[PDB]
Design a protein around this nucleic acid. Sequence first.
DNA 1: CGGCATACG
DNA 2: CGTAT
DNA 3: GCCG
Length: 327
Amino acid sequence: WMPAYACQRPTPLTHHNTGLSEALEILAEAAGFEGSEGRLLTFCRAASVLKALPSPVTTLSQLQGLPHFGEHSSRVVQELLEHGVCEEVERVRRSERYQTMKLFTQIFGVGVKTADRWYREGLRTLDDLREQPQKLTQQQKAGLQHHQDLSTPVLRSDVDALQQVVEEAVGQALPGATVTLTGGFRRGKLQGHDVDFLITHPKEGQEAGLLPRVMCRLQDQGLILYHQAFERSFCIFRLPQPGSWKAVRVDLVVAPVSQFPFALLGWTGSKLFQRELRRFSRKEKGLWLNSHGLFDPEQKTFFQAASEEDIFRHLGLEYLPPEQRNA
DNA sequence: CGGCATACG
DNA sequence: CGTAT
DNA sequence: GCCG
Ligand SMILES: [Ca+2]
Ligand SMILES: [Mg+2]
Ligand code: NA
């Protein structure tokens, strides 16, 4: 009744096992801080299974036969069901290692490997990093300066205003180019940590060289607080606020229209959904999927797609709208 | 046991 | 190394 | 950590 890959089942944004999935995602996060990508994946997948269930898990026996629930994840759920808390989870939550790796990796420009090295050097706080700024990249300096604003959720109300200003710059850069909202907001989220936009043009090839032209125009409008030929830009934008403004993370991606369905699919996520979809494609169908296309390595051919529906059909999967990709 | 998504800046 | 879903 |  529960298929093993997240791309084989609908996952809504809100569900019936929120507390259970949040606990498993703590353990997944902690596994990632320690470099165990395998354990991170299992805990993420187990969490995702619970999101896809039609009602709350109330008894341990309801986990029988669910994929990705073994001794460890089942014991976590058991303790939560019996006592309302899981000691392992609370131990992680309280730990200096978890709290500091979380704090450091949430800086734009800082990943697990950097955070871990800083942790091993004895650093613990944002002000610890500010006092030693020669150790920081320009990207990290921007992430640290803007860290407080970037920790405030972006609201869907914010997104429409940003999309309008991006469209104006895009339209001057290349008349006829389009901007599509992707990422979590396209899956129905009401808040987010950033805004993701996908840009293309209906005439194949006209999008070449577009992103620099867009970025230069946004920068001339004074809207870019930070940014790095290219096709992806990871920016910090100045977003108007009542009597002021706040910094917001915005990602811009350009794709040729031939690849647009693949880029839309990839950038709409969720992250776990796309990993599971690419895993399914390769392992179950022998096809190689990325945000550019879908390759048959036996015929050495790429699948043409005119829509996301095409891609799901190519892969033998029932279509899922973005709102059901919240794996 | 091997495998765990796949790319660009 | 960072970033993206 | 779990699947096949
Ligand atoms: Ca993003
Ligand atoms: Mg996003
Ligand atoms: Na980071």
